[PDB]
Write a protein that binds this ligand. Structure first.
Ligand SMILES: NC(=O)c1ccc[n+]([C@@H]2O[C@H](COP(=O)([O-])OP(=O)(O)OC[C@H]3O[C@@H](n4cnc5c(N)ncnc54)[C@H](O)[C@@H]3O)[C@@H](O)[C@H]2O)c1
Ligand SMILES: NC(=O)c1ccc[n+]([C@@H]2O[C@H](COP(=O)([O-])OP(=O)(O)OC[C@H]3O[C@@H](n4cnc5c(N)ncnc54)[C@H](O)[C@@H]3O)[C@@H](O)[C@H]2O)c1
Ligand SMILES: CC(=O)N[C@H]1[C@@H](OP(=O)(O)OP(=O)(O)OC[C@H]2O[C@@H](n3ccc(=O)[nH]c3=O)[C@H](O)[C@@H]2O)O[C@H](CO)[C@@H](O)[C@@H]1O
Ligand SMILES: CC(=O)N[C@H]1[C@@H](OP(=O)(O)OP(=O)(O)OC[C@H]2O[C@@H](n3ccc(=O)[nH]c3=O)[C@H](O)[C@@H]2O)O[C@H](CO)[C@@H](O)[C@@H]1O
Ligand code: NA
Ligand code: NA
Ligand code: NA
Ligand code: NA
Lengths: 338, 339
């Protein structure tokens, strides 16, 4: 398998630490039925959580993860809900009183967020604000925000919104409501990503569409990223912006060729179709030489400064009505180059 | 495959009527990346729409239908959006000025809507209200509501919510804003449905889980339901509640058995697991012997009277506040018998 070949296989997976962190917890996962959310769900059950509240706005995604976990049906509750519905979300948190929220709900596609920036802002930033505020109000002990390497020096709407969500959640962190964010890169075979695209092109005898001959990405398996996110949540004391190490980058052309080789399909061409708007060619330096080490060699802590929430709330209000979203996002993230 | 077997293959598919109806139109499809919406999008391009506005809240579903239609990308615009965001929907409608809205966005699962009746109400009823209101205000000429046979004498929250959407949209119909609803039954192989569930159980060496040995459903292919919906929309003058003829119902036990026979896994057990809450054994009579015929033999018009919108709007507000959704729904839909 191509997944197998590019797997990170990190040597510092710690089952026992995740078990101790999750034992008998009521846990709520937003985006429960997504690529990452579904794997969080599965690992929460595997590592002994008492009760899993699965929140997703996509009815098929929710149905599917509920169905996948049907052997544990007594321990899970499928909540069909947008996190933008504050009043319903508050009712959910007061009812179940989760001690941990794993926030994986977001819009993540670079091109679609470029084309729909307002919805990106609303779903990502406002949805994060609503979920985060509700968690703090409802005395959730720990809140882990799934973030992305795309939030570093963002060149696109999606990335920028995720950076704003880091700023917001980390600024809400305190002794009673401990927030951690976890940045990582491309999850192998995730929803709507390049591996399923190539797989489908091959199966339909189409040429593979490669954006640029020199483009590279960092990859890991969903089970690896999720477990490390959970180990990061487990060691968090509140306020940490974590980042995962992912090994060496992989050329997408090499990925394309390996896929072709694995299906004995060297009858097919690889066609250059050009960079998509917002897209980086090399991403960013993963780990700064001065990020703090943790006890896990795959997990580092990056520097982050709280921001004045009053100011941030004003900017977020403006984001929901303003005419130029890109320019507005810049006033919040001055490193944003769109 | 199982789909082949149970196809309807109506004799009265009419490409040309659909082509004439869709020619050069700007068409907005809500729920565009769903099972039915995706097929609506494809048929809109096939039959010569000018421009397709694809609205969906699931980024993956939208991504996928957008990619599926890559060959025709200059004719399609992917709008990542919940129809509950009135202000943004309004802006989309003003920017693109669609002439036709095909409304396929909803929550459709009996059990999930049983378990989340408030979100069923919000996403189905309020989402329909917002989209329908915005369409009329923005002078969209024709609005087609995808409905369901479950709206008839509903026994579950989902079906009841769909019936309220019928009442709302049809009561908004007038000479400028023509509304049709179309009711039909199970679409073979649709998202989250019994066929994909049985396929996975088989692929995983699991017993098939059959709710009840006697349960039956009416089935048709997505391409058939969709084209018939488009033909209904083509002949509509406003205010019609259409219903499709779907042929003979199918015992789910016979569908299970046939799946096991086709993959040669008669080694697997069929386990009876019990009816799910809200579920009917035999659905309902499809075509009332008095429903009116149309020019197509697969499409009929079911009786329906407008309700006062003043009344309905206030009942819809009550739905968003009440203690007890089921009781509140019964006020609007007095034939609702909630299992
Ligand atoms: N997939 C990757 O390669 C990758 C890499 C780094 C970070 N991330 C981050 O992980 C998070 C999840 O990514 P994914 O691959 O699982 O995407 P995904 O789209 O498969 O899953 C996201 C889930 O959230 C749900 N959702 C979205 N908005 C919602 C809302 N308002 N209310 C409730 N549910 C909502 C979706 O329906 C979906 O099931 C996103 O920020 C993403 O940016 C992903
Ligand atoms: N599948 C069947 O058997 C069947 C039979 C009869 C009627 N119907 C009706 O057909 C319609 C679609 O069913 P389907 O099988 O395609 O289901 P689906 O879930 O596959 O498709 C619905 C689509 O609507 C989207 N959506 C839901 N709420 C939304 C919102 N608030 N804003 C924007 N997008 C939203 C979803 O993301 C999804 O892509 C529903 O109206 C259902 O009520 C289905
Ligand atoms: C999963 C998804 O949809 N996007 C995520 C993905 O972004 P990213 O945009 O990298 O995800 P993709 O899987 O879409 O693309 C992976 C790589 O393949 C290339 N490519 C893509 C499609 C194609 O047809 N041909 C082609 O060559 C891209 O240019 C990119 O170099 O990882 C980032 C982490 O680093 C996250 O921030 C994004 O949320
Ligand atoms: C998920 C879905 O598309 N639901 C639609 C489906 O409902 P419906 O609930 O009939 O659709 P499903 O495919 O879930 O179920 C079909 C039949 O198979 C049975 N079954 C299902 C699952 C299983 O594990 N075992 C089993 O035996 C059910 O009891 C039912 O008799 O068609 C109706 C139209 O008639 C629509 O109103 C619903 O929106
Ligand atoms: Na899966
Ligand atoms: Na359960
Ligand atoms: Na499809
Ligand atoms: Na396009």
């Amino acid at each position: 398998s191509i997944e197998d070949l590019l797997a990170r296989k990190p040597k510092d997976l710690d089952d026992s630490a995740v078990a101790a962190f999750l034992k008998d917890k009521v846990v709520l996962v937003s985006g429960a039925g997504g690529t990452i959310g579904s794997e969080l769900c599965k690992q929460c059950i595997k590592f002994g959580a008492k009760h899993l509240i699965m929140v997703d706005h996509s009815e098929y995604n929710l149905y599917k993860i509920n169905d996948d976990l049907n052997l544990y049906k007594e321990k899970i509750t499928p909540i069909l809900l947008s996190i933008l519905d504050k009043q319903s979300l508050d009712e959910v948190l007061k009812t179940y009183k989760p001690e941990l929220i794993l926030h994986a709900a977001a819009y993540k596609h670079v091109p679609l967020c470029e084309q729909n920036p307002h919805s990106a802002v609303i779903n990502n930033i406002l949805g994060t604000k609503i979920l985060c505020d509700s968690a703090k109000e409802n005395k959730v002990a720990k809140f882990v925000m799934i973030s992305t390497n795309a939030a570093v020096r963002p060149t696109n709407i999606m990335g920028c919104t995720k950076r704003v969500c880091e700023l917001y959640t980390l600024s809400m962190s305190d002794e009673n409501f401990e927030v951690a964010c976890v940045r990582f890169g491309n999850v192998l075979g995730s929803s709507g990503s390049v591996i399923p695209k190539f797989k489908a092109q091959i199966a339909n005898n189409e040429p593979l569409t490669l954006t640029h001959p020199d483009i590279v990405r960092y990859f890991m398996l969903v089970a690896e990223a999720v477990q490390l996110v959970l180990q990061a949540g487990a060691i968090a004391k509140g306020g940490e912006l974590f980042v995962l190490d992912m090994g060496k980058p992989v050329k997408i052309i090499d990925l394309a060729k390996k896929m072709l080789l694995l299906s004995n399909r060297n009858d097919l061409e690889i066609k250059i179709t050009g960079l998509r708007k917002g897209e980086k060619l090399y991403e960013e330096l993963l780990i700064d030489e001065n990020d703090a080490k943790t006890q896990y060699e795959s997990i580092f802590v990056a520097k982050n400064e709280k921001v004045d929430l009053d100011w941030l709330n004003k900017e977020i209000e403006n984001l929901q009505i303003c005419e130029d979203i890109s320019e507005a996002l810049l006033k919040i993230v001055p490193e944003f180059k769109h």
